[PDB]
């Protein structure tokens, strides 16, 4: 007995949709859902999606509240829809997927992922829910996550972090590192070797290696000397060049975090969504150095060093493809006289 | 178990709210309620009210579908709210009353009219519903309608017509003529002796007496002669004067209907609501004669003739009060040398 | 080079999208599209759909302007989407289908119906457009219309009428009678033998047989005698019973048209969409007789007479299934002592 | 002391803005203005303009309620703004001009047309208002209307009709025929000799000459014979050709009115605005003959006959320019062997 | 070939409008512009302006991304419009000017500033763009900025700071200090002697002189003694009096910044826009001292001291006019017995 009043009752009483019986009075005005609490209207939800307000409210109430893969991972693996859950995309304040399976009458394409409409779609299966590992075994197309071993299936160790209620974290009280499995046309794929983005924030950036601790503590010249990075253009690529009108380099999140502690800058997120590489219109407040499209990736500094140190530096311009978060990221590598000039990811 | 989906189920299946169990998928976008019918969205309701869209949809679905008093009668009797029903105002596409009693969780001030919050309000009671005559006897303030005698209660015979689903009609298969009763401060009130407006339309106007048939068929001078109306200014008041830039008289609906058959005119209903006297910004298409505020009343011509013929014509300007639809209507009577110059209602 | 400004240029210059190059200034405010014409804004389109305003504007500009099957026929045939066209649903002021193929970047699921995403959908193909008959032969699911023979494909002669720019008509200067073909799961289906609804309006109803001329001209008793309809309850079913509070029968459009010429009535179309059987909340203005759900079908009176005269009248209540517009319509047949009491369609 | 509450008071009490003192309670919700009338909200105005709702409400309340030139005449004369009035465009439900002079604080560019910001704009002046003829003499650019002679100013006799509260009429109780004057760059302009469009409606079309009476009453062949119109293609141009899929000719309103009495058709007004030539997407209901862009002009048939009979018929294709409503209308004249094939206006 | 899809393509690919060819799918819902990125809608722009959403999106995409004068400077110099650019007002999330020149079809009054419509408007010219210094030389009204000397024109050295993408900064990698020139009616004006506001923030306030360093570091009595400020009411004016219900003084930003480091307070910016003097409704969180209108100016403390020390202190109340950011700012000076009581700017 699904209803707007029942969804609102669950939100008011349980903090989310929890299958509880009951109804609260609701009013819908424009894109906002309100409930009457002792004579006055209290806002329950503001629709920031392109779906109708009551539909978006239900999908948000029915969001997955366990740690789930970050949307950038699901997208990179070609996930089209989730089985009997809603992956809420907190970067976009919207459902990660257009349609649902056994969640909401307005968005459901099926009640069960075994329905033939789901066969061509890459369905997301969560092995932590009963029957989902078996539902993946019988699905034509899908991605499965598990906390442990699956009989017969060889696993791909995913990122250490997952998203719990929009907070990306490496779980200590919960498991966030999943095994990944994928199937294309009934065939269990061999997931490629991949680096993972670290999903850190600029304001609360924490180093995750001794090289990252040394990058933040040491001065530029000391760090480059200690890690034998001469000729790799870390001064441009990682530290950033704020001497000309166009801001130079600055493509690694750790470098932005280091700069941020000394002087602030503006990052205009002009395509706000979860993605492996992020593009920002950056304006350095101290110098006025700026760049319309500054591609930024949060790789562990050690991984970035391994990638740049594994390239041939004998050609002027070249595309360097690197598997990151299961997707192929194209980087542009610019060299001169056997040394790096610049190396930057491309969002495409 | 009230819900938006259940209200929509009742609308789709029963043509209105009928207390049936069930749910249909609903989408709300802006001020419109839609339901999915085989993959596509079909409009169920467009909110033209100042209430939230889902609330207005529920009150409209819960509208009274029996013949009910016209909103102008309820307003003239000081009705503030209805007991356990919604009087839908089809002229405003909105509920006739702001609040409800035992109808909808968002608009209810009480579940029963016996609650103390209802004591200062004039509650509308429908004697055709079980227990409502008793609820009127117990109410501090109220208006009651019945199809027959209530023991000991002196009745007021109401208009012949009532509104059935927005159609004003004199019932042949249903009863539309009710007995009216009213209480103020716990005391039953003697309703005044009154004329009633006929509630006719300009396009489909039908005469309801031989005098009205004669008005429509006869030329101006032969009608005035036949009914001894010389000196009563019917040429100005009823027929209308379209010779000057300001349109003269034209205050009786029958006169507008007569004019309409020969040449069209525009009636701008600038306060669109049901009322005993209506004000229109009129523009005669044939002549260009116009009037910003032309008060129009639909009285039976015989009743209008009785009213004007019952006045003293010896004073220049005078206020003539006439009880119409239970309310006191002020008419302005202008005379010169023992004859009427003009006589017009005032909407106030 | 698709754009909002180009779509608006085509609307302003060609009356619809015509593939012409050019741009006009456009402003979007709320759900309306405007264009600047000599300093002032002129409305080009008001969005009444659940799609974004600029998207609905493009689909409406790209609507099919040739005679196309009425939406009720497409729905009854299970059509999900159209190949490289937009069937505009003029009854809902919206696209007949949610998604498109090779029409608009926002709604396209594919550029060509041969794409695998289209295989499970019943694609509408128009044989009057080059390559579409071949696309139907290659489609897993589809409905095809043609003006002539397709080699080896057994045809179904469709209705005489089609919709041309929202006007349902039997073409004299254009062909409106198509051959129909349908495929389910790669297999051509034999379309059932069917009656067709006449698609007439209440206000402009025209008889299409001598029996229909006789129904409109003759009094009830002389028509029933002339066509030997005694015991078939045409008095209730077709003429309508306006003697009780609940309006009796009145399920054939011709009967509503006959009643409409004598006295008016209100038809509340509470599910506004094209369908073989329509449900209305009817209120007779003369009597006050009303019915929340009055199912109405526009069959040619001769076809209705053939259907009712082909039934066994020996059981109290029985479901009578009749193929109308290719769909199975359930009728409820109520009998007593070898005579019809009532026979009515059910909208389900 | 201008205010929203004062504007609403004037609308409620005077039918429009009348400069009266007072305030009524107002509520604004979305694009609608409401006022509280005895506890309930009554709609005063629905904004159909691109201006803010409270601003559009004020301009509409301050609209000119005297007969004013039709917007097509003002546009054809290059009028940009009006001096101390609002010309309300009833065809667009919006102000005819973006800005105002001495009307409303939000839209005013100046309080008086003598302000230098008004010098480059063509200001509309109404000689019926004190001081406006003097303001025209002092204006660098302007259009003036008067009911009589202005000393030394050579007049242009305008159309017989004017718009009074959105009703186009030839005044009997009011004057609608004005003298026109125009100034460009401080210099009075000689207005060209012109025909005028008749501004009639399809539904209520009335003939204004014996030739127009004969067109409506006589069959095609007897009218063409009576008025010696053989070889002028009136069969195509005026009567219309409904024999092919593309509707032929039908460019004179009288021809559409004649067709409309026999069988109906759809006229899609895809650029809804007042203009000398109108373009419609026409669909003939009887035949299915249609045309995306059918240019229609309402000229008096005698004037159209004079124009076509004054042309040289010796060239295949030729542009014929005709002054209509003060503007140059391009007509396309197609001939073969000394006879007209087609002659049609172009809306550009 | 300007279009909504092309503007969105440029935003997605270049971070702003950069003249690139291409189109992305766009959806407009209410006041938000979205683009489809791999099946889901991503927000590109939320309209906070009074212009139509697609128009505001284009002007924002076409904003000037070089350091430009702060809007308060342009306004104070009487700039009406900019030549071939959009000055985006980041304080209002809107274009600084109503109209444009050679930018957007919906807002353009001209394509080039040499068009006669621009002659009476004070056009903003940017000497860093080719031909703009020469366009100013020929313009009737205008303001010009340059990074260097203009032949014949004597310059006004502007503020050290400019706005780069909404970040006000003193450029180190870019030039932010411009030379200003202005022309009224073809005559090159002599810009007055002026102080400049420092445009600092409360949270990140940095001192720009030894007096400002001493103000922040020293206690009130030490600072007043060191700079001989006894009798100038700095205790009230600059430090602020938080001892009574009405907050005393606190009109210099440096004083608010000093207070902010010890205890927080609320600043309600009730007229959110760029202006030389700002008015705030301030509520001190520690004491509860508050003031509805607390005028605040960010002058360099040395400049404020020079201004207050250059006044005659012999009258009770007096208006002191000071040129700040090229505009005349009126301050109220209140004195008693040859000492300052208060001195505050007025926003008007
Ligand atoms: N297929 C199932 C799994 C997800 N849903 S649910 O509607 O979101 C839901 C969530 C919690 C309790 C009860 C129901 C139904
Ligand atoms: N609650 C306690 C009991 C076991 N765990 S745990 O969540 O499964 C876990 C284990 C290892 C790494 C990260 C998380 C913590
Ligand atoms: N530099 C531009 C080029 C296209 N994009 S994109 O639409 O935002 C995108 C993001 C992630 C995956 C796929 C596409 C950025
Ligand atoms: N107080 C009672 C009387 C009116 N209401 S109701 O909600 O409108 C309703 C109407 C018809 C069926 C079931 C419920 C409940
Ligand atoms: N069904 C028939 C039987 C009696 N009625 S009635 O509703 O009681 C009625 C009574 C008086 C006036 C008008 C109608 C109609
Ligand atoms: N004793 C008399 C005094 C007035 N009334 S009344 O019933 O309260 C009433 C009020 C307004 C309209 C119609 C009737 C009875
Ligand atoms: N002529 C104007 C004066 C005020 N009104 S009113 O607000 O619409 C109104 C109508 C009926 C009762 C009470 C108020 C009309
Ligand atoms: N797949 C094709 C068929 C329909 N479309 S279209 O975009 O609606 C269109 C219509 C008319 C002219 C040009 C384009 C492209
Ligand atoms: N233009 C004329 C020539 C032939 N046609 S037609 O379109 O092919 C047609 C065929 C059959 C029925 C109705 C119409 C009309
Ligand atoms: N063999 C028969 C069984 C049914 N069909 S059908 O074509 O698939 C069909 C489905 C729905 C409506 C009209 C026709 C053919
Ligand atoms: N009598 C009610 C029962 C449900 N409907 S329905 O949703 O409008 C519908 C109509 C046609 C096909 C399928 C569904 C009408
Ligand atoms: N410049 C004058 C002429 C028009 N306006 S007005 O505001 O529309 C107005 C109209 C009627 C009464 C009082 C004021 C003022
Ligand atoms: N009230 C009467 C008296 C004179 N007029 S009139 O307005 O001046 C007029 C003049 C010419 C044509 C049409 C109307 C009507
Ligand atoms: N000398 C002649 C040249 C043209 N004109 S005009 O008055 O400026 C004019 C412009 C547009 C429409 C109608 C009239 C007079
Ligand atoms: N046939 C199309 C061509 C452009 N238009 S237009 O924008 O509506 C227009 C109408 C009158 C004057 C100026 C422009 C119609
Ligand atoms: N007059 C010119 C200068 C400003 N514009 S523009 O549309 O904003 C633009 C910006 C960048 C590249 C191409 C065009 C046109
Ligand atoms: N990129 C280097 C080269 C010259 N500059 S600069 O931007 O022109 C500049 C100069 C003086 C003050 C402020 C800025 C820095
Ligand atoms: N104290 C009030 C008086 C008027 N203003 S104002 O409208 O915001 C303003 C701000 C800047 C310039 C000109 C006017 C503030």
Swiss-Prot record, chains A, B, C, D, E:
Every AV-Nsp11N/CoV-Nsp15M domain range: 64-189
Catalyzed chemical reaction(s): uridylyl-uridylyl-ribonucleotide-RNA = a 3'-end uridylyl-2',3'-cyclophospho-uridine-RNA + a 5'-end dephospho-ribonucleoside-RNA
Cofactor note: Likely affects Nsp15 binding to RNA.
Residues annotated as site: Transition state stabilizer: 291
Annotated ranges, domain Nsp15 N-terminal oligomerization: 3-63
Record note on what altering residue 236 to A does: Complete loss of NSP15 endonuclease activity
Localization per Swiss-Prot or TrEMBL: Host cytoplasm, Host perinuclear region
NendoU domain mapped to chain residues: 206-345
Chain positions of site Uracil recognition site: 295
Active-site positions on this chain: 236 (proton donor), 251 (proton acceptor), 291 (for uridylate-specific endoribonuclease nsp15 activity)
Cofactor(s) in the UniProt record: Mn(2+)
Subunit structure: Homohexamer.
Protein's name according to its UniProt entry: Uridylate-specific endoribonuclease nsp15
Biological source species: Severe acute respiratory syndrome coronavirus 2 (2019-nCoV)
Parent-protein residues present: 6453 to 6798 of 7096
């Amino acid at each position: 007995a699904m209803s707007l009043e029942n969804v609102a009752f669950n939100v008011v009483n349980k903090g989310h949709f929890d299958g509880q019986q009951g109804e609260v009075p609701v009013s819908i005005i424009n894109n906002t859902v309100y409930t009457k609490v002792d004579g006055v209207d209290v806002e329950l939800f503001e629709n920031k999606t392109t779906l109708p307000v009551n539909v978006a409210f239900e999908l948000w109430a029915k969001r997955n509240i366990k740690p789930v893969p970050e949307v950038k991972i699901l997208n990179n693996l070609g996930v089209d829809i989730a089985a009997n859950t809603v992956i809420w995309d907190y970067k976009r304040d919207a459902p990660a997927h257009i349609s649902t399976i056994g969640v909401c009458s307005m968005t459901d394409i099926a009640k069960k992922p075994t329905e033939t409409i789901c066969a061509p779609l890459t369905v997301f299966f969560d092995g932590r829910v009963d029957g989902q590992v078996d539902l993946f075994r019988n699905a034509r197309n899908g991605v499965l996550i598990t906390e442990g071993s699956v009989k017969g299936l060889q696993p791909s160790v995913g990122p250490k972090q997952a998203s719990l209620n929009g907070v990306t974290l490496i779980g200590e009280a919960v498991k966030t590192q999943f095994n990944y499995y994928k199937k294309v046309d009934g065939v269990v794929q061999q997931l490629p070797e991949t680096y993972f983005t670290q999903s850190r924030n600029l304001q609360e950036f924490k180093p995750r290696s001794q090289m990252e601790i040394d990058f933040l503590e040491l001065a530029m010249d000391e760090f480059i000397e200690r890690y034998k990075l001469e000729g790799y253009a870390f001064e441009h690529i990682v530290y950033g060049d704020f001497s000309h009108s166009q801001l130079g380099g600055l493509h690694l999140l750790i470098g932005l975090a280091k700069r941020f502690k000394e002087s602030p800058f503006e990052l205009e997120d002009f395509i706000p969504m979860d993605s492996t590489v992020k593009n920002y219109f950056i304006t350095d407040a101290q110098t006025g150095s700026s760049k319309c499209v500054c591609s930024v990736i949060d790789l562990l500094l050690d991984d970035f060093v391994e990638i740049i140190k594994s390239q041939d530096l004998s050609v002027v311009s070249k595309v360097v493809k690197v598997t990151i978060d299961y997707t192929e990221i194209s980087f542009m590598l610019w060299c001169k006289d056997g040394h790096v000039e610049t190396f930057y990811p491309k969002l495409q």
